[PDB]
Design an enzyme around this catalytic site. Structure first.
Site, mmCIF file in Angstrom:
data_model
loop_
_atom_site.group_PDB
_atom_site.id
_atom_site.type_symbol
_atom_site.label_atom_id
_atom_site.label_comp_id
_atom_site.label_asym_id
_atom_site.label_seq_id
_atom_site.Cartn_x
_atom_site.Cartn_y
_atom_site.Cartn_z
ATOM 1 C CE1 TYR A 110 31.796 -14.022 30.502
ATOM 2 C CE2 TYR A 110 29.400 -14.095 30.728
ATOM 3 C CZ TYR A 110 30.599 -14.728 30.450
ATOM 4 O OH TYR A 110 30.621 -16.065 30.115
ATOM 5 C CE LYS A 119 0.272 -9.183 18.189
ATOM 6 N NZ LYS A 119 -0.428 -7.955 17.879
HETATM 7 N N1 LIG Z 1 27.162 -14.356 28.012
HETATM 8 C C1 LIG Z 1 28.129 -15.257 27.421
HETATM 9 C C2 LIG Z 1 27.517 -16.654 27.375
HETATM 10 C C3 LIG Z 1 28.075 -17.538 28.482
HETATM 11 C C4 LIG Z 1 27.440 -17.219 29.831
HETATM 12 C C5 LIG Z 1 27.676 -18.333 30.848
HETATM 13 N N2 LIG Z 1 28.276 -17.755 32.090
HETATM 14 C C6 LIG Z 1 26.369 -19.048 31.121
HETATM 15 O O1 LIG Z 1 25.397 -18.486 31.630
HETATM 16 O O2 LIG Z 1 26.222 -20.232 30.822
HETATM 17 N N1 LIG Z 2 4.397 -3.929 20.577
HETATM 18 C C1 LIG Z 2 2.978 -4.210 20.643
HETATM 19 C C2 LIG Z 2 2.706 -5.489 19.858
HETATM 20 C C3 LIG Z 2 1.634 -5.293 18.794
HETATM 21 C C4 LIG Z 2 2.233 -4.698 17.522
HETATM 22 C C5 LIG Z 2 1.511 -5.126 16.248
HETATM 23 N N2 LIG Z 2 1.509 -3.981 15.285
HETATM 24 C C6 LIG Z 2 2.187 -6.339 15.656
HETATM 25 O O1 LIG Z 2 3.385 -6.351 15.364
HETATM 26 O O2 LIG Z 2 1.558 -7.374 15.443
#
Ligand SMILES: NCCCC[C@@H](N)C(=O)O
Ligand SMILES: NCCCC[C@@H](N)C(=O)O
Lengths: 358, 358
Positions: A254, A34
């Site tokens: 940031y 999946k």
């Molecule tokens: N986190 C804000 C989104 C811009 C991030 C920018 N510094 C970049 O990685 O392109």
């Molecule tokens: N976090 C584990 C992933 C499997 C979870 C399963 N219950 C699903 O969402 O399909």
């Protein structure tokens, strides 16, 4: 090109699948593929396990259709069953294994009137309390379906809520609840996820359902993938695109959240949250630079990440950066980020190119 | 099909873009469309802003190639410039605006010896401390590049670290650093992200660089998108696929994280962390069921999520669930998850289909 590539080791996946198989050598195992084979590439994973896999399990019809197109005869399980009336016809044509986990879904199956007989898996809620029947209702549906003309195999399925923990009470409770239905005529029974496959032999039943372990990420809270003999499938490799000297008192990234205490070397890496990396990955989160351990400094951006290279004086612009892979476990990175390898692998976005090796 | 769809309002993006332009009407604005237009779909977003936008800004050459394919003549800025020597010939073919941030990169541009002069934006590191030159190095590179035959436009660019906050000390430092270079001959100056477009008119310069605000998510810490007049672009909608009764003392989901304290009604939703949802979303993270406010219960899994439906007795399997959109702000959901709208929007995965509204 932007120096960021996800390399998938397909022989590791086959190795890991064979390992799961060895936990219950006389029994069968679904390859759980999946969510685009947990971000690794469903088409390529199904192809690598084409002959090895006893069967395939997926989350929806879209995914099931993709697997069937690649494997004409294999057993394919719809883990959540059908979502709407119109799916049943297509499920019949693609000869899928169905799941019935609620009354609505069961009534929809009855109303569908499919000529072609299919394997139907009745889902027991054994403590997870999301999907599945309680025992009384499942008994009622076992009665209505056992001699139904459109039912080929009537089967039983349930899922552990805390199998990742070494000794959580609910695990034994769920196992005993599953065995409370031993009287009903089932053709197949399925209980074990990756964690159960590796640590609860009593829950192996007929069909194992290993997901995460196939990709070399640990299902267990107390043992690593390396300790369990699982080979990591995904290597998320990037590069140092920038090197800076940062003086005492100056901040990085940031919110000015990281402040240099000593003359610092700060490297910028070609990976950010838009690639799948957690945005909130804290300072001290491990990363490999030229095969050597270093740590995150400052906030993770959409496209870029920063690392403290004050103790790696030989590191240069152009040096390979391993976010996770064979040298640094995705589980270690995930945990430092307050999460699990499941999430880091799943969310490697489409913009990240995929390579495949043996 | 699986009941999960990301509905994108393209005309809301057009609206938000015009709002950004109205902040500095005599100036120009880049539409920042990197990372698949922050998960909204670069192809469709660029098509909607094909004539509206003064130009486009992206994170890498691959993204730029997609933009040029759709618009033959528009200005396209590579925010991080070229990553390797071999990129320059392609950047020349696509008629892109280049960025130079470091000595290595600058030397690569010089060595490239391109057929056509291109617009060059020199990046000042004004306090972010990841990418860009110090003031002395930038002056040196200006001296080299001002009458270089491969340079058409010589420009200045820098980026704020804390413009999201009301009056951070570093914001003034960064602005003063930028202004201290304006004795040099520059064709274009660019300093303002979304945050600054709305709050720092002194940073407006010649070209604005709005990103997040285009998509109806607030760039600011203490004002919301609604208060700023920004229309939300993305609506992530799912459905209730299961509904259960859970007794007092019974647990929900992995790790038994959520324990029922009164007789509980619990619904399962067709959305999980592989769709882009934060895996670690805690109890109390808001959701809409039938337009009505409700909260999460239990760990988010790969394909599924659970909600407390105890105070919504009329909720039924099949009911629409808004994870975020026009009813519930992506910003509120992100705040509950200990992160920002940026991450939630840009990490909606390939398997979530996009529908475009008209
Ligand atoms: N986190 C804000 C989104 C811009 C991030 C920018 N510094 C970049 O990685 O392109
Ligand atoms: N976090 C584990 C992933 C499997 C979870 C399963 N219950 C699903 O969402 O399909």
């Amino acid at each position: 090109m932007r120096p960021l590539v996800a390399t998938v080791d397909l022989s590791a996946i086959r190795h890991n699948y064979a390992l799961a198989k060895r936990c219950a050598p006389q029994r069968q195992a679904f390859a759980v593929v999946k969510a685009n084979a947990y971000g690794h590439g469903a088409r390529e994973v199904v192809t690598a396990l084409h002959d090895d896999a006893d069967g395939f399990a997926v989350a929806c019809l879209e995914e099931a259709a993709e697997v069937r197109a690649l494997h004409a005869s294999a057993r394919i399980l719809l883990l959540e069953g059908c979502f709407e009336a119109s799916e049943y016809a297509l499920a019949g044509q693609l000869r899928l294994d169905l799941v019935i986990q609620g009354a609505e879904q069961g009534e929809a199956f009855l109303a569908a009137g499919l000529d072609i007989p299919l394997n139907v898996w009745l889902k027991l809620d054994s403590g997870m309390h999301r999907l599945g029947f309680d025992p009384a209702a499942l008994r009622a549906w076992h009665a209505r379906l056992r001699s139904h003309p459109g039912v080929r195999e009537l089967n039983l399925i349930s899922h552990f809520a805390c199998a990742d923990e070494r000794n959580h009470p609910l695990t034994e409770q769920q196992l005993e609840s599953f065995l409370g239905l031993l009287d009903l005529d089932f053709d197949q029974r399925s209980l074990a996820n990756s964690a159960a496959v590796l640590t609860i032999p009593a829950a192996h039943m007929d069909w194992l359902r290993p997901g995460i372990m196939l990709y070399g990420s640990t299902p267990l809270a107390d043992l690593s993938a390396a300790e369990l003999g699982l080979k990591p499938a995904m290597s998320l490799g990037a590069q140092l695109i920038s090197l800076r000297e940062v003086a005492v008192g100056e901040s990085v990234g940031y919110g000015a959240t990281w402040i240099a205490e000593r003359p610092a070397r700060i490297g910028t890496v070609s990976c950010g949250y838009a690639d799948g990396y957690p945005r909130t990955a804290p300072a001290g989160t491990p990363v490999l630079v030229g095969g050597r351990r270093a740590i995150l400094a400052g906030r993770v951006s959409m496209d870029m990440l920063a690392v403290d290279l004050s103790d790696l004086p030989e590191a240069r612009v152009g040096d390979p950066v391993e976010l996770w892979g064979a040298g640094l476990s995705v589980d270690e990175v995930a945990r430092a980020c307050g999460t699990l390898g499941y999430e880091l692998l799943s969310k490697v976005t489409a913009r990240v190119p995929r390579r495949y090796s043996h």
